[PDB]
Structure formats: structure tokens, C-alpha cells
């Protein structure tokens, strides 16, 4: 966890290593308690005894609400009683032993101690890897959320009186001895009282000082950082509250007729800043009032303005790469969209009230069934629509929202399929009679579903809303799973893991997609930064055009992890905190050997030991067929999916070992060259390499307005005809690539393209593999699904070239540049 | 309801229960029928604890002869066992607002209806009670998602 | 290479020249025929043709035997085109479970058709080695913008109406001439494949 013994007063976080370990375990040896009484005993073992020791740190408090007693040479003792400072207090010598602690250096001692506690009563997953096997101190990008790189050129020591605001007196040379003691706890108090509550902890890190000097010198010497001072510059580090972060309003003291002392300290550290506002509930207090930005938090904003205020002017604080995160996020196409907050839902909340305007009029219109149930389940309903829901944005593929339909119970549901699914049509023609019948502003009208493949009846029903929202209706009834598990039943041989395949699609479809959209609605009031996490990550995606095979659940899913497992970080409280924990796992996980089991619940239902081992021999059970993984990769099961092959089938082998290795690449970048402008932007940079074939695409009108991604959409055309001149033909165009050349290719592409597409939002392209399987000759197959070519009467190998004519011939007008290995 | 959060001039409250008036299940009670009743303790999603009573008469049918038309006293372990088990499964889905969405139209009684029939057929059932005791925490974040 | 006329078990080599492209700086498309041999009705004087290529229809079909007709002077009429599953959309029959790939069946009109069609292609066989320009290009159909976003245009409403009440109005009353008893008998032949 990094910490040692090391003076954490001089700017750096330690003050707690083996020497106060021994001390306190020592102690803890000979009492502890509040009423003296042992609390470790000599008797216990090591695992008992340490277990002691992060429990009695976890639990009891030793710096501004108690400190402990011990004697050298008598039991130890808790006192209830704190110094504000971490004090352990020897009788024998009268030693304070945690003089070199700072104060947020216990707090976050505490916050360790009890993150490792709840990893030692962890009674299911392991956690000795967490605790012990892993260096979270490596990267400060993961270890904390946001660090502020702050400069102060401060010079000498006579320059001093016009670099720091402060004084640095006769009384500060007697208590702070050195000037990064008082300059650590300067910008700890004022960045203490500027941020507050906003945060959950934060340090104050001297880059780049020394301790070892040479024989020749009387101190340590140096010139770096525009001063003489030991360090470079003052790095600011962060652990963020998501609750109390982006608020508008930094409250202060209230206002009376007389000033207090708070408020006389506040207008005297905020100032301008500091005002008097009325608040709802009829008080008037002085607070100071903020503006979010789509592009950066407050709290650089709040950082900046105290150090540019009480430490120097001279200060230069910087952090671009938490402003090129925000900027990597999908600028909404909406009023006041630059001042939206990174964690602020309200077009969520404008399809939300769509919805419940659309539910109270079908949900109560009368039918020849009364209605069971109408569920939604879509995308934006669990926040995960890579654009914000944009009212009339109909360009992009995240617009309409999936809605099942669930009639009630009744005997009129036939036992054949066709005529199953076009009695659910015909019902929907009917709700099509009442809703055309009685609610004008409403639009509709009728879709395929070929998503279930060879279930050629599947008829959505698209309602275009005043609201600007599009939503589709498809109705799940009782009579499914008996006439699907029928066909299970009826297969032969030869068919059955096709039908496995449209039966796990089906079940993927409307089934998991209920209580999927319960458990991460349910949970994301829990998990905030969630959110923009999975659509960037989703966007991380689509630039490396590995969006469309890897589904999106299965990226929710990928992606829940670091909030739903915190061990051994915290929780995320950046997207650039979460998002590289993600990328990180991913470079760091082994899908072969290693299973990805979790725990959809809130933070302190969950799974007990029974239930794991029993996903855990299905994982034994998966891998004793699919050793190497060729037929199945990902293995991501909970008790949702205890399955593990729901959201996760029928992916090919270099769609997953070029997700693992695109992210092996990501991470060893951010180890190797740091963190900047331009690794970042490598970061979202296709490297279109390693393929047998790209195809570089763009249809001649652009879209990205139409997207509603801001660089207006308006009303629905009268003719809805007119819709698909705005939808993008190249998904069905890589959609039906992908369809004829299963067997033969694998083909990736930019599903979304107002996004990745350029400027105008209208470039794409495929990039196509040919398997190993097709690389050589091959004996002649009536069954041999592969465009070839003779080399003798027997043999044939693979034609690229007729492919090559296939693809720029079925992209006639929109494959504009073609290039080969 | 049940107040939770206060904000000058507005407060917003929460739902603890429903009961039916003295008059309306006293109008039901009819001589020469039987009363069948049932109740089930249940966890919704979010962990509110809930037990809902039951209400089930039996009705006559048509061209019936004799005035009272009965049960057989093990119809009516029949007739609860049916109602027990489809109360578990509605509940313990998409928090009590939904479930409040379902109370309101009563689509809970058709479900009854249609399942319970095939042993007896039945007349009024409806759902007679609704209360919670096991409320787990504070929780503002839930509470702000259903306001406009 | 150019030398072969023939498979091993018999399919009839036939090439195809491909045209040109703006991203694209003479190749031949390779499809393979032969007789088909069933006792079915519907499928006499067919072809076993493997490796068709892209979005073949009956349009271009009679476009190419129209072409061997034109070429050696013969009478060849083709009739229709079977089981052209280019997409794996038909492989599959769910409808009787409820309750070869890449390759299709050209059907002509009689058997001087097939015949003389078929020693057409044994002398079209031989172009990939006597003369390769003299081989027939295969012009593909090109999907447009508006091809492509015919599978996002809406549905004609009032004929599927008509579909529904066409398709159930016959198939309900067969169904309702077949009865009862039957349908007894047949679900619990599925009992006896329940138990047993």
C-alpha cells in the first residue's frame, strides 16, 4: 500500500510502517482495550494476531476521537479521548510514536484497515491476492482519482515573502521545521476547507525530493521546480465522494444579524466567492455558487482558486488529462450542454416521463386481455446508451428503446410458432387501432426482428413520441419457452447447438433483459460514475471497432466490476479511475484459467459458498470441453447468469485475444510512456493493422448532428419513409457481410458512426480476417461454405479476390479505398 | 403514506399501506358461501418486508340447483396453495412503485383468477392489505429518481 | 490451373470474369455445377450448383444461360431458381419442430434444357484453358443507399392484415376438419416418447 515510516509531514504518505507495526502489535500483545483487557493474546496465530491488528485500526480511533496508551516498561490502555492529531502514547519513555503521521494519513489508515477487514471477513471470494499480491501504488491514476499537478516556483528563502501569502515566521521555524512541513500543511488545510466534503480523502505529495545527499554537503541541495527547496513541485492527490462532488452549491455558515467567527473565516477565505443565497427552505446562508462544465469537475475550479488565493499566485495547477477524459464523453446536442455535469441524468429522466406519459395510455386501454405487464428494457432505461437520449435523434442505433409486452395469463396462445408470434402481430395491430384511434401525437408503425434468427415473425411495434423518443413493443407471453424447449426436444444431432444458439439469444433477449434492467436500474443509484464508464468504454469500443461482436451487456457486465469488487482500490471516483481499472483487469485477467464471477448487490442477497462453487464447476465443467476457449471465451456468471455463456456465446477467438491484446497494449503504454495529451489519444486511435483486408468506407451525407452529438434535429418527416434516408446503411451492410461470410471471415466495423466518423460524422470502415482454417488447400465439399479456386482437379484454396469484388460490388458507391495486406 | 424528506413549502412522502373501508368487505359478506382467506410474507427487491392478506368468496354458476354451492374442505387447501405460490412470484421485482402500478388496476386478481379456476371457479378476490415493517435505510438516491 | 474442366466427382468448372471498381486497381469468380439426382418433383432436371455467387437471383441466372444460348446456338429455358439460401436464412425448418450450404438447385423447364445446357458447360468447361477472355463476367446487383435501408422502411400494414386472416382462415379450418381426437393422439405420441 506504499506506506512506511518515512516522515509523511515532509509531503508524502507514510508516518505508519514495520517499526509502529511492531510497536502497536507489541502493545496489542499487552492489552488494547477499553477497559485494558487483552485484545491479541500470545497464543494466537499470525493470521489471528494480524486480524487483531487491522481490526483494532478498522475499528478504533486514534486521532481525533481517542489515542492509546502503553508502557515500555503497565497493560495498554484506550483512551476515548483524541489530540487531533494520530497519538500513541507511551508511559515508560512519554513517546508519541505517531508523530510522523499526519492526520489524513490515519483517516486513510482507517479507510485501509477497514477496506482490508471486510477483505479478511470475505468468507467467498479470495482476497490474499488483494491484500498482499498487489501493487496499488504503482500508478497514482489508479490508486487515487484526481491528482492536480501544482507548480510553485517559490525561489530562495528571501523570496519567500513575496511567493508565500502565508507567513513563515519566528513561530512556524519553531513548529514546522522545514518548509515543506508547513507548505504540505498549508495546502492540507486550505484545501481541507476549500474541497471539504466534496472529497472522500486527500494527500499532498512533494515530487521528486531527496534524503540522500553527498559527504561533501551540510544538507540536501537542490535547484529544481524554480526553487531551492526539497522537492520539484506539489502533486495533488484525491479520493472523491460521488454524492457531494458536483454540487452547485458549496455551503458555508448561515446567515444571523450578528457575524460569527465561521463566517468571518469564510468570507475571509472565499470572499467573491463567498455570498449570501436564500435556500429553499427559507434560510439565507452565505455559500459559494459554482458552474459544472462538460469538460471538467468543480474541484479543479475550487483547487485552483484557494491556491491561486492563500499559498501563491505564482501557482500553476494543471490537470488536462481528467479534461480530455470529459472531453472523450459524447457532447449531448442540447440547451446548455457545455455547463452539464458529469454526473447529472436529466434526458434520462425526459424519456422516463415519455414512457410513463405513453404507459398510462396503452396501460390502460382495454383489450381482449386485460394487461399483466409492460416492461421496459431498454438501453437508456439503464443509462447505458452510449449518445444521451436526444429528443428526435433518430440517427443514432441507441434510439429506439426495447419494451416487452406481457398479456395475461390465458389459454389463447396456439402451440406453433408462426402462428404464436403472428397472433402477438395481430394484437399489436389492434393496440396500433386504439393508439392511432385515440392518440394523434403518438406515431407508429411496424419492424422486423431477424435478431432471432429463423423466428421471421418477430414484428416490433415503433412509437415516435412528442417527447422525441422512440420506443418498440414486443410481446413475451408463457407459451415461448414450452414450444422452444419442444424444438430442443425435437432436434436431432446434427441441429442442436444452432438452436441453442436462437434459444440462448431468446433467452438473452427478452428474458434476462427484465431483471438485468431491475438489478443495474436498482443498483445505479449505488455506483454513480457507472455510467459514463460503460459508454466510454463502449465508445473505447467502437474506435476499435469491437462494439459489434462483443455485445453490450457483456460489456456492462466487463465493466461492473471495479465497483461491485472494490478490493484492493477503493471504489472509482473519476471515469478515469474506473475506466483504467477496467482496462487494467482486462490486460490483467486470463479468461483461459480464470473466471469472472460477481456480485450484483448493493454496497454494506449476495451469493453464498454453495452457489459459487457451483459456478465455479460449471467453469470446470466448461473448460473439461472448451480447454483453449475456442468455442467459448468470456466466462462472466453471477446469480443472474449463473450460466456464464448468456451474454457471452458466439464470439470468435482473435475478437477476444484482440480485445485482451489492444488492452495489454493500452495499459503498457500508460506504464511505459506516462500519462499525457497524446497517449490518450492513442488510446482512441484505431491501429487497423494485422488484418487480411480493410475496406475504408463513408456514405456521401454526413450525420453527425442528426445523432444529436454536438460538433438540430427537429420534428419526424411526414413520411416515415423518409427515416431511413437518416439511418445508417452500412450496419446492415457489414450486418449482411457478416452474415453470408461466417464460415469463411471476421468482419469489424464502426457500428455507430456519428460518433467515430469524422468531422461530419460519415466515415467507417471494415476490417476483415480470414481464419486459419482457410488458408490453404482443402479438399473439394459439397458443404464447403468458402469462395475458391482450383489448384487440381481435388483441391481448391481461397479466391480473395472474388471476395474483393464482392465487397467493393456490394459496397458500390461507398467503398471508396481499398487496401490489402 | 409516510412522510421522508422536507424541503420549505414542500415535503415528499413514501407509501406504507392500503386498506380497504369497513363498508365494502361487509358488503361482500353473503350468507351460504365460504370465506377464503390467505396471507404471505414476502420480500420485495429492494429489501421492504411486506405481508398482503387475501380475500376469496365462492360464487354460484349457472343453471346451479342447490343454494349454497360449497367447497369440499380440501378445495380449499387447493384454493390457498394456488394463491400462495403466485404471491411469491410478483413480488420481489421492480421496487413497490411497480408493484403499487400493478395494485391499482388490479392485475394481481386476474392472475389469481385465471390460475385458482380450473379447481373452483370463484367471485369478488381482491387484495384487502398491504403493510411494511422492515424498511432498510434512509436512502435518498432511489427516492429523487420518481420527481419532476 | 487453367488446364481443368472438372471435378473429381464431376462438377462442371464454370468461371466468371469479374468487373472493375474505383477502389479497386481481371479475376474469375468460380461456380460449379452438376446433375442433381433425386426422385423429388419439384427438383427434376435441377442442378447441383456449389459456390454461386454474390446475390444470385433468377435474374442473372437466365441472364448466363441466356448467354449459353446465345454462345453455342442452342434452346435452353430455365424455369426457376431453389434453395438459394445465400445467408443461412432458410437452412433451418422451426415451424415442424414447434409443433449444402452455399450451394442451390437450378430448376429448368425440361430435360432438352438440362441436356443441351449441360453439354454447354461441358464446352464452357474448357474457356478457362482454350480462351479466358472469351469466358462469360458475371455482373453483380449492386445494393444502393436505398437498398440497404429498405430493412429499416416500415411494413405495408393492410397486407399483413391479409396475411393474418388469409393464413389463419385455411390453416384453422384444416386444423378444425382435424380435430379433437387427433390432436390427442398425436401429443401423446409424444408421450409415448415422454415416457419411453
Known amino acids: 500500500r506504499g506506506f512506511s515510516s518515512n516522515m509523511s509531514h515532509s509531503g508524502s504518505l507514510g508516518g505508519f510502517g514495520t517499526f509502529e507495526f511492531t510497536i502497536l502489535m507489541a502493545a496489542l500483545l499487552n492489552g488494547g482495550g477499553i477497559n485494558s483487557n487483552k485484545i491479541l493474546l500470545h497464543g494466537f496465530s499470525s493470521y489471528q494476531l494480524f486480524k487483531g491488528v487491522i481490526k483494532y485500526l478498522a475499528t478504533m480511533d486514534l486521532c481525533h476521537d481517542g489515542h492509546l496508551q502503553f508502557h515500555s516498561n503497565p497493560a495498554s490502555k484506550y483512551i476515548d479521548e483524541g489530540f487531533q492529531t494520530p497519538t500513541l502514547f507511551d508511559k515508560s519513555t512519554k513517546v508519541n510514536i505517531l508523530t510522523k503521521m499526519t492526520v489524513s494519513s490515519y483517516q486513510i489508515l482507517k479507510e485501509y484497515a477497514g477496506e482490508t477487514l471486510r477483505m479478511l471477513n470475505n468468507v467467498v471470494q479470495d482476497q490474499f491476492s488483494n491484500i498482499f499480491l498487489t501493487n496499488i501504488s504503482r500508478f497514482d491514476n489508479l490508486k487515487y482519482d484526481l491528482c492536480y499537478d501544482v507548480q510553485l516556483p517559490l525561489g530562495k528563502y528571501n523570496n519567500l515573502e513575496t511567493s508565500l501569502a502565508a507567513t513563515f515566521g519566528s513561530m512556524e521555524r519553531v513548529k514546522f521545521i522545514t518548509l515543506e512541513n508547513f507548505l504540505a500543511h498549508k495546502i492540507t488545510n486550505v484545501a481541507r476547507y476549500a474541497l471539504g466534503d466534496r472529497i472522500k480523502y486527500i494527500q499532498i505529495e512533494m515530487v521528486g525530493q531527496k534524503s540522500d545527499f553527498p559527504i561533501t554537503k551540510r544538507k540536501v541541495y537542490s535547484n529544481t521546480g524554480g526553487n531551492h527547496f526539497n522537492f520539484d513541485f506539489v502533486r495533488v492527490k484525491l479520493i472523491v465522494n460521488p454524492s457531494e462532488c458536483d454540487k452547485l452549491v458549496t455551503k458555508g455558515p448561515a446567515h444571523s444579524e450578528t457575524m460569527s467567527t465561521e463566517a468571518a473565516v469564510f468570507k475571509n477565505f472565499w470572499g467573491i466567492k463567498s455570498s449570501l443565497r436564500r435556500f429553499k427552505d427559507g434560510s439565507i446562508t452565505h455559500c459559494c455558487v459554482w458552474s459544472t462544465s462538460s469538460s471538467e469537475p468543480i474541484i479543479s475550479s475550487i483547487v485552483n482558486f484557494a491556491l491561486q488565493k492563500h499559498v501563491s499566485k505564482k501557482a500553476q495547477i494543471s490537470n488536462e488529462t481528467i479534461k480530455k477524459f470529459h472531453n472523450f464523453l459524447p457532447l449531448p446536442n442540447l440547451p446548455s450542454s457545455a455547463k452539464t455535469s458529469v454526473l447529472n441524468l436529466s434526458s434520462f429522466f425526459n424519456l422516463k416521463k415519455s414512457f410513463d406519459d405513453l404507459y398510462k395510455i396503452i396501460f390502460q386501454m382495454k383489450l381482449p386481455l386485460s394487461v399483466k405487464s409492460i416492461l421496459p428494457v431498454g438501453s437508456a432505461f439503464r443509462y447505458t446508451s452510449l449518445c444521451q437520449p436526444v429528443p428526435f435523434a433518430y440517427s443514432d442505433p441507441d434510439f429506439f428503446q426495447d419494451v416487452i409486452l406481457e398479456f395475461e395469463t390465458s389459454p389463447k396462445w396456439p402451440d406453433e410458432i408462426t402462428s404464436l408470434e403472428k397472433a402477438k402481430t395481430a394484437f399489436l395491430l389492434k393496440i396500433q387501432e386504439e393508439l392511432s384511434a385515440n392518440s394523434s401525437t403518438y406515431r407508429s408503425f411496424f419492424s422486423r426482428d431477424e435478431s432471432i434468427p429463423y423466428n421471421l415473425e418477430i414484428v416490433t411495434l415503433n412509437i415516435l413520441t412528442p417527447e422525441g423518443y422512440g420506443f418498440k413493443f414486443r410481446v413475451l407471453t408463457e407459451r415461448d419457452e414450452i414450444l422452444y424447449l419442444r424444438a430442443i426436444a425435437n432436434a436431432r444431432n446434427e441441429l442442436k447447438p444452432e438452436l441453442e444458439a436462437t434459444f440462448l439469444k431468446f433467452t ?171 497517449t490518450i489519444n492513442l488510446l482512441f486511435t484505431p491501429g487497423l493493422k494485422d488484418y487480411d483486408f480493410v475496406v475504408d468506407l463513408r456514405t456521401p451525407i454526413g450525420l453527425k448532428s442528426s445523432c444529436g452529438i454536438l460538433s438540430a434535429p427537429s420534428n419526424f418527416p411526414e413520411n416515415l419513409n423518409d427515416l431511413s434516408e437518416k439511418m445508417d446503411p452500412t450496419y446492415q451492410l457489414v450486418k449482411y457481410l457478416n452474415l453470408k461470410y461466417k464460415n469463411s471471415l471476421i468482419l469489424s466495423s464502426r457500428k455507430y458512426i456519428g460518433v467515430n466518423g469524422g468531422e461530419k460524422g460519415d466515415k467507417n470502415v471494415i476490417t476483415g480476417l480470414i481464419k486459419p482454417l482457410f488458408k490453404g488447400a482443402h479438399k473439394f465439399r459439397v458443404n464447403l461454405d468458402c469462395n475458391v479456386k482450383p489448384v487440381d482437379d481435388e483441391n481448391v484454396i481461397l479466391n480473395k479476390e472474388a471476395i474483393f469484388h464482392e465487397i467493393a460490388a456490394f459496397g458500390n458507391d461507398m467503398v471508396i479505398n481499398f487496401e490489402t495486406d | 403514506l409516510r412522510v421522508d424528506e422536507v424541503q420549505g413549502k414542500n415535503l415528499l412522502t413514501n407509501f406504507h399501506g392500503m386498506d380497504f373501508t369497513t363498508d365494502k368487505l361487509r358488503s361482500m359478506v353473503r350468507k351460504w358461501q365460504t370465506l377464503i382467506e390467505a396471507n404471505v410474507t414476502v420480500k420485495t427487491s429492494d429489501d421492504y418486508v411486506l405481508r398482503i392478506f387475501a380475500i376469496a368468496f365462492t360464487r354460484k354458476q349457472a343453471n346451479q340447483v342447490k343454494r349454497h354451492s360449497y367447497a369440499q374442505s380440501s378445495h380449499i387447501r387447493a384454493i390457498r396453495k394456488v394463491i400462495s405460490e403466485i404471491l411469491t412470484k410478483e413480488v420481489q421485482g421492480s421496487t413497490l412503485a411497480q408493484l403499487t402500478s400493478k395494485l391499482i388496476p388490479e392485475v394481481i386478481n386476474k392472475e389469481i383468477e385465471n390460475a385458482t379456476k380450473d379447481i373452483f371457479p370463484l367471485q369478488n378476490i381482491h387484495v384487502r392489505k398491504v403493510k411494511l415493517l422492515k424498511q432498510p435505510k434512509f436512502d435518498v438516491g432511489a427516492l429523487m429518481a420518481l420527481h419532476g | 490451373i487453367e488446364d481443368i474442366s472438372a471435378m473429381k466427382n464431376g462438377f462442371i468448372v464454370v468461371p466468371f470474369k469479374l468487373p472493375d471498381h474505383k477502389a479497386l486497381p481481371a479475376s474469375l469468380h468460380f461456380m460449379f455445377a452438376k446433375r442433381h439426382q433425386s426422385s423429388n418433383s419439384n427438383e427434376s432436371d435441377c442442378l447441383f450448383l456449389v459456390n454461386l455467387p454474390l446475390l444470385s437471383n433468377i435474374e442473372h441466372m437466365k441472364k448466363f444461360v441466356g448467354q449459353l444460348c446465345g454462345k453455342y446456338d442452342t434452346v435452353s429455358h430455365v424455369e426457376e431458381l431453389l434453395y438459394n439460401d445465400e445467408f443461412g436464412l432458410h437452412e433451418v425448418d422451426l415451424s415442424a419442430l414447434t409443433s449444402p450450404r452455399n450451394t442451390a438447385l437450378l430448376k429448368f423447364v425440361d430435360a432438352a434444357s438440362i441436356n443441351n445446357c449441360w453439354n454447354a458447360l461441358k464446352k464452357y468447361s474448357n474457356l478457362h484453358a482454350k480462351h479466358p477472355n472469351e469466358l462469360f463476367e458475371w455482373t453483380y446487383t449492386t445494393p444502393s443507399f436505398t437498398t440497404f435501408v429498405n430493412f429499416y422502411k416500415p411494413l405495408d400494414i393492410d397486407y399483413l392484415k391479409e396475411d393474418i386472416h388469409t393464413h389463419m382462415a385455411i390453416f384453422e379450418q384444416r386444423e378444425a376438419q382435424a380435430q379433437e381426437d387427433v390432436q390427442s393422439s398425436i401429443v401423446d405420441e409424444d408421450g409415448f416418447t415422454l415416457v419411453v
Open chain 1, 508 to 678: 438473452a433477449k427478452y428474458l434476462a433483459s427484465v431483471r438485468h434492467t431491475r438489478t443495474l436500474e436498482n443498483i445505479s443509484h449505488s455506483y454513480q460514475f457507472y455510467s459514463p464508464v460503460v459508454r466510454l468504454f463502449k465508445r473505447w469500443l467502437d474506435t476499435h471497432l469491437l462494439l459489434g461482436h462483443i455485445t453490450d451487456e457483456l460489456a456492462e457486465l466487463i465493466a461492473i466490476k471495479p465497483f461491485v469488487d472494490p478490493a484492493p482500490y477503493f471504489i472509482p471516483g473519476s471515469l478515469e479511475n474506473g475506466f483504467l481499472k477496467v482496462l487494467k483487469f482486462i490486460s490483467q485477467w486470463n479468461w483461459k484459467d480464470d473466471p469472472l464471477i460477481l456480485d450484483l448487490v448493493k454496497p454494506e442477497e449476495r451469493l453464498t459458498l454453495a452457489q459459487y462453487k457451483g459456478i465455479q464447476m460449471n467453469f470446470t465443467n466448461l473448460r473439461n470441453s472448451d480447454p483453449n476457449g475456442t468455442h467459448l471465451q468470456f466466462f462472466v456468471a453471477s446469480k443472474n447468469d449463473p450460466s456464464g455463456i448468456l451474454y457471452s456465446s458466439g464470439i470468435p477467438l482473435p475478437i477476444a485475444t484482440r480485445l485482451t491484446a489492444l488492452a495489454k497494449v493500452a495499459v503498457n503504454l500508460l506504464q511505459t510512456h506516462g500519462l499525457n495529451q497524446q
